[PDB]
Symmetry: C2
Amino acid sequence: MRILILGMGGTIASVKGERGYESALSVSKILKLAGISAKIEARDLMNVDSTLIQPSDWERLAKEIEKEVWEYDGIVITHGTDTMAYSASMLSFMLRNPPIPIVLTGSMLPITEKNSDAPFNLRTALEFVKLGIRGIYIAFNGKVMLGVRASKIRSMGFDAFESINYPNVAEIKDDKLRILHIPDFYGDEFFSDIKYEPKVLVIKLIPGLSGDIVREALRLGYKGIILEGYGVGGIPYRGTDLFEVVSSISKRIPVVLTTQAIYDGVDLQRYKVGRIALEAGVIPAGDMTKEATITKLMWILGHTKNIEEVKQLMGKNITGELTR
Amino acid sequence: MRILILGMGGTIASVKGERGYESALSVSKILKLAGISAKIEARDLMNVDSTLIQPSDWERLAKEIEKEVWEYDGIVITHGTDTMAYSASMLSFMLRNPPIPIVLTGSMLPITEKNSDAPFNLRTALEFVKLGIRGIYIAFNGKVMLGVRASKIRSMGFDAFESINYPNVAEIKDDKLRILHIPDFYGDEFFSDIKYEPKVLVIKLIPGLSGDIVREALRLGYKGIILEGYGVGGIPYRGTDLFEVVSSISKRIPVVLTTQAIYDGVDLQRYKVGRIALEAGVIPAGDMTKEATITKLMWILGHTKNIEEVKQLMGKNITGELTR
Protein backbone atom coordinates (compact mmCIF):
# COMPACT_ATOMS: atom_id res chain seq x y z
CA MET A 1 0.00 0.00 0.00
CA ARG A 2 1.82 3.06 -1.31
CA ILE A 3 0.04 6.40 -0.74
CA LEU A 4 0.84 9.91 -1.98
CA ILE A 5 -0.32 12.99 -0.07
CA LEU A 6 -0.20 16.33 -1.89
CA GLY A 7 -0.63 19.65 -0.11
CA MET A 8 -2.56 22.61 -1.52
CA GLY A 9 -2.76 24.75 1.61
CA GLY A 10 -5.97 25.68 3.40
CA THR A 11 -7.11 25.83 7.02
CA ILE A 12 -5.67 22.38 7.68
CA ALA A 13 -2.27 23.97 7.00
CA SER A 14 -3.07 27.19 8.85
CA VAL A 15 -2.02 28.61 12.19
CA LYS A 16 -2.80 31.84 14.09
CA GLY A 17 -0.42 34.66 13.25
CA GLU A 18 -2.01 37.34 15.43
CA ARG A 19 -3.61 38.37 12.14
CA GLY A 20 -6.00 35.44 12.19
CA TYR A 21 -5.36 32.05 10.60
CA GLU A 22 -2.91 31.85 7.70
CA SER A 23 -1.45 28.89 5.79
CA ALA A 24 1.94 28.03 7.29
CA LEU A 25 2.44 24.26 7.58
CA SER A 26 3.88 21.79 5.09
CA VAL A 27 2.20 18.41 4.49
CA SER A 28 4.88 16.42 6.32
CA LYS A 29 4.48 18.65 9.37
CA ILE A 30 0.69 18.33 9.12
CA LEU A 31 0.98 14.55 9.29
CA LYS A 32 3.24 14.67 12.34
CA LEU A 33 1.09 17.22 14.17
CA ALA A 34 -1.84 14.88 13.55
CA GLY A 35 0.05 11.88 14.86
CA ILE A 36 0.06 9.78 11.70
CA SER A 37 2.92 7.48 10.68
CA ALA A 38 1.80 1.77 5.07
CA LYS A 39 4.16 3.86 2.90
CA ILE A 40 3.13 7.51 2.83
CA GLU A 41 5.01 10.00 0.68
CA ALA A 42 4.19 13.62 1.47
CA ARG A 43 4.55 16.39 -1.08
CA ASP A 44 3.77 20.11 -1.17
CA LEU A 45 2.46 21.41 -4.49
CA MET A 46 1.73 24.80 -2.97
CA ASN A 47 0.45 26.27 0.29
CA VAL A 48 -2.33 28.70 -0.57
CA ASP A 49 -4.41 30.50 2.07
CA SER A 50 -8.08 29.52 2.06
CA THR A 51 -10.19 31.34 -0.57
CA LEU A 52 -7.17 32.05 -2.80
CA ILE A 53 -7.26 28.97 -5.05
CA GLN A 54 -7.44 29.92 -8.76
CA PRO A 55 -8.30 27.84 -11.90
CA SER A 56 -4.62 27.83 -12.78
CA ASP A 57 -4.07 25.73 -9.63
CA TRP A 58 -6.38 22.98 -10.93
CA GLU A 59 -4.14 22.56 -13.96
CA ARG A 60 -1.00 22.21 -11.86
CA LEU A 61 -2.81 19.75 -9.61
CA ALA A 62 -4.23 17.70 -12.47
CA LYS A 63 -0.84 17.36 -14.16
CA GLU A 64 0.75 16.28 -10.89
CA ILE A 65 -1.82 13.57 -10.20
CA GLU A 66 -1.69 12.45 -13.83
CA LYS A 67 1.97 11.46 -13.62
CA GLU A 68 1.61 9.72 -10.26
CA VAL A 69 -1.65 7.91 -10.78
CA TRP A 70 0.25 4.79 -11.95
CA GLU A 71 2.87 4.86 -9.16
CA TYR A 72 0.53 4.87 -6.15
CA ASP A 73 -2.47 2.97 -4.90
CA GLY A 74 -4.13 6.09 -3.62
CA ILE A 75 -3.72 9.85 -3.43
CA VAL A 76 -4.89 12.21 -0.70
CA ILE A 77 -4.98 15.97 -1.18
CA THR A 78 -5.06 18.41 1.73
CA HIS A 79 -7.05 21.43 0.54
CA GLY A 80 -8.82 24.53 1.82
CA THR A 81 -12.54 23.91 2.41
CA ASP A 82 -13.82 27.03 0.65
CA THR A 83 -12.93 25.78 -2.82
CA MET A 84 -12.58 22.03 -2.21
CA ALA A 85 -15.77 21.12 -4.12
CA TYR A 86 -14.56 23.22 -7.08
CA SER A 87 -11.23 21.39 -7.27
CA ALA A 88 -12.79 17.94 -6.83
CA SER A 89 -15.31 18.62 -9.59
CA MET A 90 -12.80 20.13 -12.02
CA LEU A 91 -10.42 17.21 -11.46
CA SER A 92 -13.28 14.82 -12.14
CA PHE A 93 -13.83 16.39 -15.55
CA MET A 94 -10.09 16.63 -16.37
CA LEU A 95 -9.02 13.18 -15.16
CA ARG A 96 -11.68 10.75 -16.25
CA ASN A 97 -11.73 7.11 -15.21
CA PRO A 98 -8.90 7.47 -12.67
CA PRO A 99 -7.31 4.07 -11.88
CA ILE A 100 -6.98 4.76 -8.17
CA PRO A 101 -8.83 6.45 -5.30
CA ILE A 102 -8.08 10.18 -5.18
CA VAL A 103 -9.51 11.90 -2.13
CA LEU A 104 -9.54 15.54 -1.12
CA THR A 105 -9.86 16.56 2.51
CA GLY A 106 -9.17 19.45 4.87
CA SER A 107 -10.59 20.87 8.11
CA MET A 108 -12.67 23.62 9.72
CA LEU A 109 -10.08 24.23 12.42
CA PRO A 110 -6.29 24.15 12.13
CA ILE A 111 -4.46 21.21 13.72
CA THR A 112 -3.22 23.60 16.42
CA GLU A 113 -6.63 24.37 17.92
CA LYS A 114 -8.22 21.97 20.40
CA ASN A 115 -11.04 19.73 19.22
CA SER A 116 -9.63 20.12 15.72
CA ASP A 117 -11.16 17.91 13.06
CA ALA A 118 -7.96 17.65 11.03
CA PRO A 119 -6.61 14.34 12.40
CA PHE A 120 -10.01 12.71 12.07
CA ASN A 121 -10.38 13.83 8.43
CA LEU A 122 -6.82 12.78 7.55
CA ARG A 123 -7.43 9.43 9.18
CA THR A 124 -10.71 8.92 7.30
CA ALA A 125 -9.22 9.83 3.93
CA LEU A 126 -6.33 7.40 4.48
CA GLU A 127 -8.74 4.72 5.65
CA PHE A 128 -10.85 5.12 2.52
CA VAL A 129 -7.86 5.16 0.17
CA LYS A 130 -6.92 1.70 1.42
CA LEU A 131 -10.32 0.34 0.35
CA GLY A 132 -9.44 0.46 -3.35
CA ILE A 133 -12.55 2.21 -4.68
CA ARG A 134 -11.34 4.30 -7.60
CA GLY A 135 -12.73 7.74 -8.38
CA ILE A 136 -12.34 11.26 -7.04
CA TYR A 137 -13.87 11.95 -3.63
CA ILE A 138 -14.06 14.25 -0.65
CA ALA A 139 -13.61 12.87 2.88
CA PHE A 140 -15.08 15.01 5.64
CA ASN A 141 -16.55 14.56 9.14
CA GLY A 142 -16.63 10.76 8.91
CA LYS A 143 -18.05 10.54 5.39
CA VAL A 144 -16.68 9.94 1.91
CA MET A 145 -18.65 11.65 -0.87
CA LEU A 146 -18.20 11.62 -4.65
CA GLY A 147 -16.40 14.90 -5.32
CA VAL A 148 -18.68 15.98 -8.12
CA ARG A 149 -21.67 15.60 -5.77
CA ALA A 150 -20.25 17.40 -2.76
CA SER A 151 -21.20 20.91 -1.68
CA LYS A 152 -20.16 23.04 1.27
CA ILE A 153 -23.36 23.92 3.10
CA ARG A 154 -21.75 25.10 6.35
CA SER A 155 -19.06 27.74 6.88
CA MET A 156 -18.18 26.89 10.49
CA GLY A 157 -19.56 23.60 11.82
CA PHE A 158 -17.64 20.33 11.41
CA ASP A 159 -20.25 18.83 9.07
CA ALA A 160 -19.51 21.37 6.34
CA PHE A 161 -19.89 19.02 3.36
CA GLU A 162 -22.85 17.07 2.14
CA SER A 163 -23.53 14.77 -0.81
CA ILE A 164 -26.39 16.56 -2.55
CA ASN A 165 -29.04 14.57 -4.42
CA TYR A 166 -26.78 11.51 -4.27
CA PRO A 167 -25.90 9.03 -1.50
CA ASN A 168 -22.67 8.96 0.53
CA VAL A 169 -20.07 6.52 -0.77
CA ALA A 170 -18.74 5.56 2.66
CA GLU A 171 -19.54 6.25 6.32
CA ILE A 172 -17.99 5.46 9.68
CA LYS A 173 -20.07 2.99 11.71
CA ASP A 174 -18.88 1.27 14.88
CA ASP A 175 -15.52 3.01 14.49
CA LYS A 176 -14.90 1.73 10.97
CA LEU A 177 -15.32 2.95 7.39
CA ARG A 178 -18.23 1.07 5.85
CA ILE A 179 -18.84 1.25 2.10
CA LEU A 180 -22.47 2.14 1.31
CA HIS A 181 -22.30 1.77 -2.46
CA ILE A 182 -19.65 1.78 -5.16
CA PRO A 183 -20.00 4.44 -7.88
CA ASP A 184 -20.11 2.51 -11.16
CA PHE A 185 -19.95 4.90 -14.12
CA TYR A 186 -16.24 4.62 -14.83
CA GLY A 187 -14.92 3.24 -18.08
CA ASP A 188 -11.63 1.52 -18.86
CA GLU A 189 -9.46 4.20 -20.44
CA PHE A 190 -7.97 6.85 -18.21
CA PHE A 191 -7.72 10.11 -20.17
CA SER A 192 -6.64 13.59 -19.14
CA ASP A 193 -8.24 16.68 -20.64
CA ILE A 194 -6.61 19.49 -18.69
CA LYS A 195 -8.27 22.20 -20.76
CA TYR A 196 -10.85 24.78 -19.72
CA GLU A 197 -12.15 28.35 -20.01
CA PRO A 198 -12.20 30.08 -16.58
CA LYS A 199 -14.06 33.26 -17.51
CA VAL A 200 -17.70 32.57 -16.67
CA LEU A 201 -20.00 34.68 -14.48
CA VAL A 202 -22.45 33.53 -11.81
CA ILE A 203 -25.28 35.95 -11.01
CA LYS A 204 -28.05 35.39 -8.48
CA LEU A 205 -31.54 36.20 -9.63
CA ILE A 206 -33.20 38.74 -7.34
CA PRO A 207 -36.55 40.51 -7.75
CA GLY A 208 -36.17 43.57 -9.97
CA LEU A 209 -32.88 42.43 -11.50
CA SER A 210 -32.21 43.97 -14.93
CA GLY A 211 -30.46 42.49 -17.96
CA ASP A 212 -27.98 45.37 -18.24
CA ILE A 213 -25.43 43.44 -16.16
CA VAL A 214 -25.83 40.41 -18.44
CA ARG A 215 -25.26 42.51 -21.55
CA GLU A 216 -22.23 44.06 -19.85
CA ALA A 217 -20.83 40.63 -18.99
CA LEU A 218 -20.87 39.67 -22.67
CA ARG A 219 -19.04 42.89 -23.53
CA LEU A 220 -16.46 42.32 -20.78
CA GLY A 221 -15.69 39.04 -22.51
CA TYR A 222 -17.30 36.39 -20.27
CA LYS A 223 -17.60 33.19 -22.35
CA GLY A 224 -20.50 31.80 -20.34
CA ILE A 225 -23.01 32.81 -17.68
CA ILE A 226 -24.81 30.98 -14.90
CA LEU A 227 -28.00 32.46 -13.43
CA GLU A 228 -28.93 31.27 -9.92
CA GLY A 229 -32.73 31.30 -10.13
CA TYR A 230 -35.58 30.43 -7.77
CA GLY A 231 -37.35 27.16 -7.10
CA VAL A 232 -37.42 24.82 -10.08
CA GLY A 233 -36.21 27.54 -12.43
CA GLY A 234 -37.47 30.34 -14.63
CA ILE A 235 -36.49 33.82 -15.76
CA PRO A 236 -38.61 36.86 -14.83
CA TYR A 237 -40.23 38.49 -17.88
CA ARG A 238 -42.21 41.04 -15.86
CA GLY A 239 -41.23 44.62 -15.09
CA THR A 240 -37.68 44.04 -16.29
CA ASP A 241 -35.81 43.52 -19.53
CA LEU A 242 -33.94 40.55 -18.04
CA PHE A 243 -35.78 38.06 -20.21
CA GLU A 244 -35.45 39.93 -23.52
CA VAL A 245 -31.75 40.48 -22.86
CA VAL A 246 -31.16 36.81 -22.01
CA SER A 247 -33.06 35.70 -25.12
CA SER A 248 -30.40 37.55 -27.08
CA ILE A 249 -27.20 36.84 -25.12
CA SER A 250 -28.02 33.11 -24.93
CA LYS A 251 -27.49 32.84 -28.69
CA ARG A 252 -23.94 34.15 -28.48
CA ILE A 253 -22.80 32.53 -25.20
CA PRO A 254 -24.26 29.77 -23.07
CA VAL A 255 -26.59 30.98 -20.33
CA VAL A 256 -27.12 28.24 -17.75
CA LEU A 257 -30.01 28.29 -15.30
CA THR A 258 -29.39 26.74 -11.87
CA THR A 259 -31.18 26.97 -8.48
CA GLN A 260 -30.73 29.20 -5.45
CA ALA A 261 -31.92 26.18 -3.47
CA ILE A 262 -29.49 23.57 -2.18
CA TYR A 263 -31.55 20.42 -2.79
CA ASP A 264 -33.64 19.00 -5.66
CA GLY A 265 -32.20 21.14 -8.46
CA VAL A 266 -33.85 22.47 -11.60
CA ASP A 267 -36.67 21.33 -13.89
CA LEU A 268 -37.58 23.93 -16.50
CA GLN A 269 -40.57 21.87 -17.63
CA ARG A 270 -42.60 22.41 -14.44
CA TYR A 271 -43.91 26.01 -14.69
CA LYS A 272 -44.78 28.36 -17.55
CA VAL A 273 -41.89 30.68 -16.72
CA GLY A 274 -39.64 27.65 -16.98
CA ARG A 275 -40.91 26.75 -20.44
CA ILE A 276 -40.56 30.35 -21.57
CA ALA A 277 -37.01 30.40 -20.20
CA LEU A 278 -36.26 27.17 -22.06
CA GLU A 279 -37.45 28.93 -25.22
CA ALA A 280 -35.18 31.94 -24.69
CA GLY A 281 -32.31 29.47 -24.90
CA VAL A 282 -31.31 28.98 -21.26
CA ILE A 283 -29.50 25.67 -20.54
CA PRO A 284 -30.77 23.56 -17.57
CA ALA A 285 -28.34 22.45 -14.85
CA GLY A 286 -30.42 19.47 -13.75
CA ASP A 287 -29.64 18.29 -10.23
CA MET A 288 -25.93 19.16 -10.44
CA THR A 289 -24.24 20.94 -7.55
CA LYS A 290 -23.35 24.62 -8.07
CA GLU A 291 -19.66 23.68 -8.03
CA ALA A 292 -20.01 20.82 -10.51
CA THR A 293 -22.12 23.12 -12.73
CA ILE A 294 -19.66 25.98 -12.73
CA THR A 295 -16.59 23.81 -13.31
CA LYS A 296 -18.33 21.71 -15.96
CA LEU A 297 -19.26 24.79 -17.98
CA MET A 298 -15.66 26.04 -17.68
CA TRP A 299 -14.34 22.65 -18.78
CA ILE A 300 -16.77 22.41 -21.68
CA LEU A 301 -15.98 25.97 -22.81
CA GLY A 302 -12.39 24.81 -23.07
CA HIS A 303 -13.36 22.40 -25.85
CA THR A 304 -16.22 24.10 -27.67
CA LYS A 305 -18.09 27.39 -27.86
CA ASN A 306 -21.06 26.17 -29.90
CA ILE A 307 -24.27 26.72 -27.93
CA GLU A 308 -25.80 23.46 -29.16
CA GLU A 309 -22.78 21.37 -28.19
CA VAL A 310 -22.65 23.10 -24.81
CA LYS A 311 -26.32 22.35 -24.25
CA GLN A 312 -25.88 18.64 -24.99
CA LEU A 313 -22.66 18.19 -23.03
CA MET A 314 -24.24 20.04 -20.12
CA GLY A 315 -27.16 17.60 -20.03
CA LYS A 316 -24.85 14.61 -20.35
CA ASN A 317 -23.77 12.59 -17.31
CA ILE A 318 -20.00 12.67 -17.81
CA THR A 319 -18.69 11.44 -14.43
CA GLY A 320 -21.70 10.90 -12.22
CA GLU A 321 -22.34 14.61 -11.67
CA LEU A 322 -25.95 14.49 -12.82
CA THR A 323 -28.99 12.26 -12.66
CA ARG A 324 -30.84 11.82 -15.95
CA MET B 1 -61.26 36.53 15.75
CA ARG B 2 -61.23 38.69 12.60
CA ILE B 3 -58.64 37.51 10.07
CA LEU B 4 -57.62 39.12 6.77
CA ILE B 5 -56.23 36.92 3.99
CA LEU B 6 -54.37 38.56 1.09
CA GLY B 7 -53.54 36.77 -2.13
CA MET B 8 -50.34 37.37 -4.04
CA GLY B 9 -50.83 34.43 -6.36
CA GLY B 10 -48.27 31.67 -6.59
CA THR B 11 -48.27 27.91 -7.00
CA ILE B 12 -50.94 27.56 -4.33
CA ALA B 13 -53.22 29.34 -6.81
CA SER B 14 -52.01 27.73 -10.04
CA VAL B 15 -53.66 25.41 -12.55
CA LYS B 16 -51.91 22.85 -14.77
CA GLY B 17 -52.89 25.06 -17.73
CA GLU B 18 -51.28 23.94 -20.99
CA ARG B 19 -47.84 25.56 -21.11
CA GLY B 20 -47.11 24.37 -17.59
CA TYR B 21 -48.30 25.80 -14.27
CA GLU B 22 -49.47 29.40 -13.91
CA SER B 23 -51.52 31.02 -11.13
CA ALA B 24 -55.20 31.71 -11.85
CA LEU B 25 -57.29 30.75 -8.81
CA SER B 26 -58.55 33.51 -6.49
CA VAL B 27 -58.13 33.92 -2.73
CA SER B 28 -61.80 33.17 -2.08
CA LYS B 29 -61.77 29.96 -4.10
CA ILE B 30 -58.52 28.86 -2.45
CA LEU B 31 -59.99 29.12 1.04
CA LYS B 32 -63.19 27.18 0.31
CA LEU B 33 -61.12 24.66 -1.65
CA ALA B 34 -59.21 23.94 1.57
CA GLY B 35 -61.95 22.87 3.96
CA ILE B 36 -62.16 26.25 5.65
CA SER B 37 -65.03 28.78 5.46
CA ALA B 38 -63.90 32.31 12.79
CA LYS B 39 -64.60 35.56 10.92
CA ILE B 40 -62.27 35.65 7.92
CA GLU B 41 -62.11 37.83 4.81
CA ALA B 42 -60.20 37.37 1.56
CA ARG B 43 -58.81 40.03 -0.77
CA ASP B 44 -56.60 39.79 -3.86
CA LEU B 45 -53.76 42.26 -4.29
CA MET B 46 -52.53 40.38 -7.34
CA ASN B 47 -52.09 36.98 -8.96
CA VAL B 48 -48.48 36.98 -10.10
CA ASP B 49 -46.96 33.85 -11.65
CA SER B 50 -44.08 31.76 -10.29
CA THR B 51 -41.19 34.28 -10.16
CA LEU B 52 -42.48 37.65 -11.37
CA ILE B 53 -42.67 39.43 -8.01
CA GLN B 54 -40.76 42.72 -7.92
CA PRO B 55 -39.81 45.38 -5.30
CA SER B 56 -42.80 47.55 -6.31
CA ASP B 57 -45.12 44.78 -5.14
CA TRP B 58 -43.47 44.83 -1.69
CA GLU B 59 -44.53 48.45 -1.31
CA ARG B 60 -48.12 47.79 -2.38
CA LEU B 61 -48.34 44.85 0.02
CA ALA B 62 -46.75 46.95 2.77
CA LYS B 63 -49.22 49.85 2.51
CA GLU B 64 -52.16 47.50 1.96
CA ILE B 65 -51.19 45.89 5.28
CA GLU B 66 -50.52 49.13 7.12
CA LYS B 67 -54.04 50.47 6.63
CA GLU B 68 -55.46 47.22 8.05
CA VAL B 69 -53.06 46.44 10.88
CA TRP B 70 -55.54 47.83 13.41
CA GLU B 71 -58.82 46.51 12.01
CA TYR B 72 -57.78 42.87 12.43
CA ASP B 73 -56.13 40.44 14.84
CA GLY B 74 -54.08 38.65 12.22
CA ILE B 75 -53.14 38.58 8.55
CA VAL B 76 -52.32 35.64 6.29
CA ILE B 77 -50.68 36.14 2.91
CA THR B 78 -50.89 33.42 0.28
CA HIS B 79 -47.72 33.74 -1.77
CA GLY B 80 -45.50 31.97 -4.29
CA THR B 81 -42.68 30.02 -2.64
CA ASP B 82 -39.98 31.27 -5.00
CA THR B 83 -39.66 34.69 -3.39
CA MET B 84 -41.63 34.29 -0.17
CA ALA B 85 -38.51 34.79 1.97
CA TYR B 86 -37.81 38.02 0.05
CA SER B 87 -41.28 39.44 0.67
CA ALA B 88 -41.30 38.30 4.29
CA SER B 89 -37.89 39.85 4.86
CA MET B 90 -38.75 43.18 3.27
CA LEU B 91 -42.00 43.44 5.24
CA SER B 92 -40.05 42.88 8.44
CA PHE B 93 -37.94 45.97 7.80
CA MET B 94 -40.79 48.13 6.43
CA LEU B 95 -43.40 47.28 9.08
CA ARG B 96 -41.57 47.59 12.37
CA ASN B 97 -43.31 46.53 15.59
CA PRO B 98 -46.33 44.78 14.03
CA PRO B 99 -49.11 44.67 16.67
CA ILE B 100 -50.66 41.53 15.16
CA PRO B 101 -49.54 38.20 13.61
CA ILE B 102 -48.72 38.49 9.90
CA VAL B 103 -48.09 35.09 8.31
CA LEU B 104 -47.12 34.19 4.77
CA THR B 105 -47.78 30.73 3.32
CA GLY B 106 -47.87 28.93 0.01
CA SER B 107 -47.37 25.38 -1.25
CA MET B 108 -45.26 23.25 -3.56
CA LEU B 109 -48.40 21.87 -5.22
CA PRO B 110 -51.58 23.71 -6.25
CA ILE B 111 -54.72 23.08 -4.17
CA THR B 112 -56.21 21.89 -7.44
CA GLU B 113 -54.14 18.73 -6.96
CA LYS B 114 -54.36 15.46 -5.03
CA ASN B 115 -52.34 15.33 -1.82
CA SER B 116 -51.64 19.06 -1.83
CA ASP B 117 -49.85 20.65 1.11
CA ALA B 118 -51.83 23.86 0.66
CA PRO B 119 -54.63 22.90 3.08
CA PHE B 120 -52.17 21.86 5.77
CA ASN B 121 -50.07 25.02 5.32
CA LEU B 122 -53.14 27.24 5.39
CA ARG B 123 -54.50 25.54 8.49
CA THR B 124 -51.15 25.96 10.20
CA ALA B 125 -51.06 29.67 9.33
CA LEU B 126 -54.60 30.30 10.56
CA GLU B 127 -53.99 28.14 13.62
CA PHE B 128 -50.88 30.15 14.50
CA VAL B 129 -52.43 33.56 13.79
CA LYS B 130 -54.89 32.77 16.59
CA LEU B 131 -52.16 32.49 19.23
CA GLY B 132 -51.69 36.24 19.54
CA ILE B 133 -47.93 36.03 18.85
CA ARG B 134 -47.10 39.19 16.88
CA GLY B 135 -44.49 39.57 14.16
CA ILE B 136 -43.90 38.56 10.54
CA TYR B 137 -43.57 34.82 9.96
CA ILE B 138 -43.77 32.09 7.34
CA ALA B 139 -45.73 28.90 8.00
CA PHE B 140 -44.85 25.83 5.97
CA ASN B 141 -44.85 22.05 6.37
CA GLY B 142 -45.94 22.29 10.01
CA LYS B 143 -43.44 24.94 11.07
CA VAL B 144 -43.75 28.64 11.79
CA MET B 145 -40.52 30.55 11.29
CA LEU B 146 -39.49 34.14 11.86
CA GLY B 147 -39.78 35.50 8.31
CA VAL B 148 -36.52 37.43 8.34
CA ARG B 149 -34.85 34.11 9.28
CA ALA B 150 -36.52 31.75 6.82
CA SER B 151 -34.81 30.54 3.66
CA LYS B 152 -35.86 28.31 0.78
CA ILE B 153 -33.38 25.42 0.81
CA ARG B 154 -35.40 22.87 -1.18
CA SER B 155 -36.92 23.40 -4.63
CA MET B 156 -39.15 20.32 -4.82
CA GLY B 157 -39.95 18.55 -1.54
CA PHE B 158 -42.61 19.71 0.93
CA ASP B 159 -40.06 20.75 3.59
CA ALA B 160 -38.91 23.65 1.40
CA PHE B 161 -38.36 26.34 4.03
CA GLU B 162 -36.05 26.35 7.02
CA SER B 163 -35.16 28.70 9.86
CA ILE B 164 -31.46 29.50 9.30
CA ASN B 165 -29.14 29.92 12.31
CA TYR B 166 -32.25 30.51 14.44
CA PRO B 167 -34.86 28.17 16.01
CA ASN B 168 -38.40 27.70 14.76
CA VAL B 169 -41.08 29.77 16.48
CA ALA B 170 -43.71 27.04 16.31
CA GLU B 171 -43.76 23.37 15.30
CA ILE B 172 -46.39 20.63 15.19
CA LYS B 173 -46.08 18.12 18.02
CA ASP B 174 -48.64 15.37 18.69
CA ASP B 175 -50.79 17.01 16.02
CA LYS B 176 -50.88 20.43 17.66
CA LEU B 177 -49.07 23.68 16.98
CA ARG B 178 -46.64 24.11 19.85
CA ILE B 179 -44.92 27.41 20.59
CA LEU B 180 -41.18 26.88 21.06
CA HIS B 181 -40.33 30.50 21.82
CA ILE B 182 -41.72 33.99 21.38
CA PRO B 183 -39.58 36.59 19.59
CA ASP B 184 -39.38 39.63 21.85
CA PHE B 185 -37.03 42.04 20.06
CA TYR B 186 -40.21 44.00 19.24
CA GLY B 187 -41.08 47.40 20.66
CA ASP B 188 -44.55 48.83 21.34
CA GLU B 189 -45.11 51.81 19.03
CA PHE B 190 -45.98 50.68 15.50
CA PHE B 191 -44.64 52.51 12.46
CA SER B 192 -43.89 51.98 8.78
CA ASP B 193 -40.63 52.79 7.02
CA ILE B 194 -41.76 51.96 3.51
CA LYS B 195 -38.77 53.01 1.40
CA TYR B 196 -36.13 51.21 -0.66
CA GLU B 197 -33.63 51.32 -3.52
CA PRO B 198 -34.07 48.21 -5.70
CA LYS B 199 -30.91 48.37 -7.81
CA VAL B 200 -28.31 46.19 -6.08
CA LEU B 201 -26.63 43.15 -7.58
CA VAL B 202 -25.55 39.82 -6.16
CA ILE B 203 -22.69 37.88 -7.74
CA LYS B 204 -21.23 34.61 -6.43
CA LEU B 205 -17.49 34.52 -5.90
CA ILE B 206 -15.81 31.76 -7.88
CA PRO B 207 -12.16 30.91 -8.33
CA GLY B 208 -10.48 33.26 -10.79
CA LEU B 209 -13.27 35.89 -10.73
CA SER B 210 -12.15 39.33 -11.97
CA GLY B 211 -13.14 42.69 -10.52
CA ASP B 212 -14.21 43.94 -13.96
CA ILE B 213 -17.85 43.05 -13.33
CA VAL B 214 -17.83 45.05 -10.08
CA ARG B 215 -16.38 48.15 -11.69
CA GLU B 216 -19.04 47.95 -14.41
CA ALA B 217 -21.89 47.56 -11.94
CA LEU B 218 -20.91 50.97 -10.55
CA ARG B 219 -20.91 52.57 -13.99
CA LEU B 220 -24.25 50.93 -14.81
CA GLY B 221 -25.85 52.64 -11.84
CA TYR B 222 -25.96 49.85 -9.23
CA LYS B 223 -26.10 51.34 -5.75
CA GLY B 224 -24.98 48.31 -3.81
CA ILE B 225 -23.14 45.08 -4.43
CA ILE B 226 -23.46 41.83 -2.50
CA LEU B 227 -20.67 39.30 -2.93
CA GLU B 228 -21.68 35.72 -2.08
CA GLY B 229 -18.42 34.47 -0.59
CA TYR B 230 -16.89 31.04 -0.05
CA GLY B 231 -17.30 30.56 3.66
CA VAL B 232 -16.11 32.35 6.76
CA GLY B 233 -15.19 35.36 4.63
CA GLY B 234 -12.49 36.72 2.36
CA ILE B 235 -11.89 38.35 -1.05
CA PRO B 236 -9.35 36.69 -3.40
CA TYR B 237 -6.35 38.83 -4.38
CA ARG B 238 -4.14 36.10 -5.84
CA GLY B 239 -3.92 36.08 -9.65
CA THR B 240 -6.95 38.37 -9.89
CA ASP B 241 -7.70 42.11 -9.74
CA LEU B 242 -10.92 41.51 -7.76
CA PHE B 243 -9.56 42.63 -4.41
CA GLU B 244 -7.98 45.69 -6.03
CA VAL B 245 -11.27 46.71 -7.69
CA VAL B 246 -13.34 46.10 -4.53
CA SER B 247 -10.95 48.24 -2.45
CA SER B 248 -11.89 51.33 -4.43
CA ILE B 249 -15.51 50.59 -5.36
CA SER B 250 -16.27 49.83 -1.70
CA LYS B 251 -15.63 53.52 -1.02
CA ARG B 252 -18.19 54.77 -3.55
CA ILE B 253 -20.89 52.14 -3.27
CA PRO B 254 -21.42 49.73 -0.37
CA VAL B 255 -20.21 46.21 -1.15
CA VAL B 256 -21.43 43.54 1.25
CA LEU B 257 -19.78 40.20 1.79
CA THR B 258 -22.00 37.29 2.80
CA THR B 259 -21.50 33.56 2.40
CA GLN B 260 -22.51 30.95 -0.14
CA ALA B 261 -23.04 28.38 2.62
CA ILE B 262 -26.59 28.26 4.00
CA TYR B 263 -25.52 27.83 7.63
CA ASP B 264 -23.31 29.69 10.13
CA GLY B 265 -22.91 32.87 8.12
CA VAL B 266 -19.86 35.09 7.91
CA ASP B 267 -17.05 36.20 10.27
CA LEU B 268 -14.33 38.40 8.77
CA GLN B 269 -12.12 38.14 11.85
CA ARG B 270 -11.21 34.46 11.57
CA TYR B 271 -8.70 34.45 8.71
CA LYS B 272 -6.06 36.95 7.65
CA VAL B 273 -7.76 37.17 4.25
CA GLY B 274 -10.90 38.24 6.09
CA ARG B 275 -9.21 40.99 8.13
CA ILE B 276 -7.72 42.28 4.89
CA ALA B 277 -11.17 42.40 3.29
CA LEU B 278 -12.66 44.16 6.33
CA GLU B 279 -9.90 46.77 6.14
CA ALA B 280 -10.42 47.25 2.40
CA GLY B 281 -13.97 48.45 3.02
CA VAL B 282 -16.28 45.44 2.62
CA ILE B 283 -19.37 45.14 4.85
CA PRO B 284 -19.98 41.84 6.76
CA ALA B 285 -23.47 40.33 6.59
CA GLY B 286 -23.11 38.48 9.88
CA ASP B 287 -25.31 35.38 10.03
CA MET B 288 -28.25 36.87 8.11
CA THR B 289 -30.06 34.85 5.47
CA LYS B 290 -29.25 35.77 1.88
CA GLU B 291 -32.82 37.05 1.48
CA ALA B 292 -32.68 39.19 4.61
CA THR B 293 -29.23 40.50 3.57
CA ILE B 294 -30.44 41.53 0.11
CA THR B 295 -33.72 43.10 1.19
CA LYS B 296 -32.07 44.84 4.12
CA LEU B 297 -29.50 46.52 1.84
CA MET B 298 -32.24 47.66 -0.53
CA TRP B 299 -34.20 49.00 2.40
CA ILE B 300 -31.21 50.83 3.89
CA LEU B 301 -30.24 52.33 0.53
CA GLY B 302 -33.74 53.79 0.49
CA HIS B 303 -32.76 56.68 2.74
CA THR B 304 -28.96 56.94 2.62
CA LYS B 305 -25.84 56.38 0.50
CA ASN B 306 -23.22 57.05 3.17
CA ILE B 307 -20.97 53.99 3.36
CA GLU B 308 -20.44 54.18 7.12
CA GLU B 309 -24.13 54.53 7.88
CA VAL B 310 -25.08 51.53 5.74
CA LYS B 311 -22.26 49.53 7.33
CA GLN B 312 -23.58 50.52 10.76
CA LEU B 313 -27.19 49.60 10.02
CA MET B 314 -26.27 46.39 8.17
CA GLY B 315 -24.61 45.43 11.45
CA LYS B 316 -27.54 46.49 13.64
CA ASN B 317 -30.09 43.92 14.77
CA ILE B 318 -33.11 45.83 13.44
CA THR B 319 -35.82 43.18 13.71
CA GLY B 320 -34.39 39.77 14.63
CA GLU B 321 -32.43 39.15 11.42
CA LEU B 322 -29.02 38.94 13.06
CA THR B 323 -27.32 37.64 16.19
CA ARG B 324 -24.99 40.42 17.40
